[PDB]
């Protein structure tokens with residue numbers, strides 16, 4: 001599926017081919033950016049504090065739990081996606097990985113089934 005690796009500051013370090021397809025950003029364009037470019041407001045402006053709160057309390061809200069959220073593509077379109085966050089260490093500093101599963105089709109079929117009674 002789509003995978004993203006960021007450093008302890010939310011800056012994208014690695015961006016898989018499938019993440020490019022899904023988000024609309026090539027790997028080169030993404031790598032120097034904050035991960036928040038992939039999400040809409042209010043999460044966007046709050047993501048850095050989500051990361052900071054975790055590094056300070058060590059209390060996970062998504063790590064080891066998973067969560068369905070709304071992500072944002074480059075063209076502006078938003079979409080539902082499941083997210084799993086993993087924690088890793090490299091060169092003494094923390095890095096996090098995000099495995100993403102696009103749930104757009106699921107949301108569509110569900111919504112479609114409901115509108116037909």
Ligand code: HEM
Nearest residue numbers: 004006038039043050054060061062063069071096097098
């Ligand atoms: C792109 C759509 C994304 C959205 C909407 C999103 C949203 C959120 C939200 C809502 C929180 C926790 C807020 C709370 O419950 O306290 C959070 C935590 C965090 N996110 Fe994301 N996130 C996104 C993607 C990512 C990705 C791709 C990564 C890593 C590659 C990531 C790294 C983190 C980390 C490290 C935390 C804190 C972990 C924790 O609280 O357990 N996020 N994110």
